[PDB]
Structure formats: structure tokens, C-alpha cells
Amino acid sequence: GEIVSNEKSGVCINAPAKTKLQPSVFHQVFEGSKEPAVLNSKDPRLKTDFEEAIFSKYTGNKIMLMDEYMEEAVDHYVGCLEPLDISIDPIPLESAMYGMDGLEALDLTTSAGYLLQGKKKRDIFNRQTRDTTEMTRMLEKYGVDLPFVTFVKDELRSREKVEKGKSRLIEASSLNDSVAMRVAFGNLYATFHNNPGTATGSAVGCDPDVFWSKIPILLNGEIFAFDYTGYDASLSPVWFACLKKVLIKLGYTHQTSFIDYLCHSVHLYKDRKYIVNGGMPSGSSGTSIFNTMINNIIIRTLLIRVYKGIDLDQFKMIAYGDDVIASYPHKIDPGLLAEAGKHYGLIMTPADKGTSFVDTNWENVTFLKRYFRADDQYPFLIHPVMPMKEIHESIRWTKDPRNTQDHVRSLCYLAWHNGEEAYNEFCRKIRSVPVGRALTLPAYSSLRRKWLDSF
């Protein structure tokens, strides 16, 4: 991705509020070093220029025609999707706004992107009546292909990323474009949400508690895994063209216009309008699905390029955006694939760091930050294991201390998969300060019983 122009826009995106994150009652109880992201250039923790840091994720584009390996990768991925019979038909506007099977109702808490005019999603949306008349009028009034509004994401970051100014950005699409994309691709989204696995190659919308046990069965060969640096922003237009070819082969036609809208995008930040060629915007309706579909093309492309004689029908993969876990019957060198990725302008790191390191296996591999651990009693059931370090970092901060009981409970639903001893220790530390001693916490046996019973 590359910013190809920058100028005064004509509008003024308000400066962000200060962070909603503050030390929680548990800040001193637990170890941790993350802090809220830098949100403005006057933050005293900065050790470098803020604006340069946040836009540094755009590393340029590898301009090129689609190559022979991409054409084969696209064809194989389309073959994997065809048994799902994705309908190219639009879904009704009512479904796009208020939900259907496989597609949740439109998120009412994210920006309408409208934001300069005091019109809120709440005004246009009425889930009780499921009314589409105000949205229809707004689509008529403003159309689609509108700019994205840039917000800095209010969230915890490592201390290094705080002082390097490596905060993340939300590139929020207009409510018009979200709605229009959901109309055009709603059945595709639903198909993906309803079929996490190795046909979609997707984990978006999955429930790790139940989906984890399926993963080793679907990926039953010699596994490998990747993490990327700046995946979204590093994507070159050629990868969006591959995605367009997949959609065309599914039977879409004029709907590739929605991919052009993601490939060549207009962004609003402060008083600037900047235009980005390549780079997936973060806050579009299909951001996650399309990032995932593109990763399915990428990994195949790299495999075919590096190895002659690959039979892709034995390759299997599952991705969530940039995060990839994959399988092939014979061992490969994922470091060679990573170098191949460089040729296409991608920066990826294999889980296997070299010949001296232990081979990627079910004991050391991660997906969605979680490890995999077979249950003692039922070793065919796989626990998703969020590291306690992650839970420790998150429990030390709160955006609203009135949600402490809800936040802590949801952390317990993650923590207990680390085993009974780790969970008792976690609960004991929670109950080392007043508020914690008063909280309701699920018992280990109760969590395990609910877990076993969600299959």
C-alpha cells in the first residue's frame, strides 16, 4: 500500500478524546507493561514523530501483472469454495441492516463515517421496526464510494510501540458503503461465518471453544504457520486483482467495484484527504473476510512458486485476516515461502524460525493468539489456550470500572483453559483486593461442564 496524494480536504475531523483506558483495581495485583496507545503527537511518552510512525505501515506496492502462480492459486481456491454454492444474489436491505442467518445486525456502536453532521446510526436504525426507509433515503442522498474516516485506535499497546508511536488506525467506511457491501456480499459473508474450516480457509466468526477441536482434524499433515508485519497495509493492488478474479469465478460481475473501493481508497484525517493505492482499509464491512480470502490466495501462490510438483488438493489452511495456520502432507521450508513473500511485497515470519528450532507442532503453534492443548480426560477435545500473560495485561486496565464484573467474567472464560491450578491462582489474585473479593467468578468445574456441553 502507498499514499499517492495528500492535500487539504475541505472538512475537519475532530481531534480524538483522550484515552478511555485507566488503571483498574488490578493494576498492581498482576504483572504487565502495556499502556494505552499514543493518540496524539503531544503525548510525552513519544520518542519519535507520531504522524510518521502511524503512516509508516504503508511500505509501497509491488506493481505487477498477475503471474502464473497467482492464476493457479486463484483457480485452486475457487475450487475449494465451489461446494459451498455461494449465492451471488443480493440480500434484502433489511437483512443487511438488521441481520439474517450467518450475518449479525449492523454494529451500531462504530462510527457512521454523517459524523460531521450530527446524524447517528441510532437515528437511521430502528431494530424494533426493522425500518429501511431512512437508510434508503440516505443511500439515495449520498451514494456510495465515499471516503473513509481515520481514527487512531484507543487500545493497549506494548511499551515499545507506545514510545515508537506505533499506534493502530481505524479506517472507518461510511455507513452507506458498509450497507451497500453487505447487500452485495451478504450471502458470501454468511457462507463464510457458517463454514469456518478448510473450504473457506477461514476462521472469521468462529467460536474457539468448540472450533479448536476441529482444527487439528482439518489440518492433519505437517503443519506450518505465519505471522505478518503490517499485512493489511502491505497488500499490493495485484492481490486485490486476484481477489477480484475469485469473485468473478464465483459468478460476481459488477460487484468487483466494491474491491476497487478497497484497493484505491480516499481517507480523511484532521484537515487532510489522502489517497491510498493498495492496502486493505481496516474498518470496511468486508475487511476481515476479504483479508482472509486474500491470504488463501497468497499462501497457495507462495507454495506453487517455491515448489514445483505441489499438489494443492493435499494443502489445507485456515486463516483469520493475516493469521494463518496450514498443513501439507510432507515437511516444507516455510522460510522459503516467507522469502517468496518478499518478492510480492509481503513481510511474514514463520512459526518455525530455523533448523535449530523445534518444528512447528500442536504444542507450540498459535492461532488467534491461542495455543492448543489436548484435554487430559478427552484428548480428542482441544482447549484454546490464551496465555495468562495476555489476560494479565488486559485485566490491569479498564475503560469503565462499572464493567469490572463483566470484563473479569469474560477473562475467566478464557483463563480456565490454562488448567485448574493456573485458574485457582488467577482467582486467588483477583480476590486479593476488595472489589475482586466481592466479584462472582465461575467455578472451574462449572466452566468445564459448560465447555463439554457446548458441543
- Annotated binding-site positions for NADPH: 107, 286, 288, 320
Question: What's the distance, CA 47 to chain centroid?
Answer: 28
C-alpha cell at 240: 486485490
**CB burial readout 293-332, b (16+ within 10 A) else e:** bbbbbbbbbbbbbbeeebebeebbbbbbbbbbbbbbeeeb
> Residue 217: CB partners within 8 Å, gap ≥ 6?
none
**What are the DSSP E strand ranges found in 193-331?**
222-228, 264-269, 272-277, 316-320, 323-328
Rounded to whole angstroms, the Cα distance separating 395 from 23 reads 9
Cell numbers representing residue 5 in the block:
496524494
Counting DSSP H helices and E strands in the chain, the numbers are 19, 15
Q: In 3D, which of 40, 61, 36, 63 has the Cα closest to residue 50?
A: 40
3-class SS at 58?
coil
Q: Which residues of 68-83 are buried (b: 16+ CB within 10 A; e: fewer)?
A: ebbebbbebbbebbee
User: CA 289, CA 350: separation in Å to the nearest integer?
Assistant: 22
**φ, ψ for residue 313, nearest 5 deg:** -70, -15
Transcribe 345-381 into DSSP letters. T--EEES---TTSPPP-TTT--BTTBEEEE-SS-TTS
What gap in Å lies between CA 203 and CA 198, rounded to an integer? 9
Tell me the residue type at 57.
K
Q: State the binding site.
A: 107, 286, 288, 320
Distance CA 383, CA 277 (A): 41
C-alpha span between 41 and 51 (Å, rounded): 7
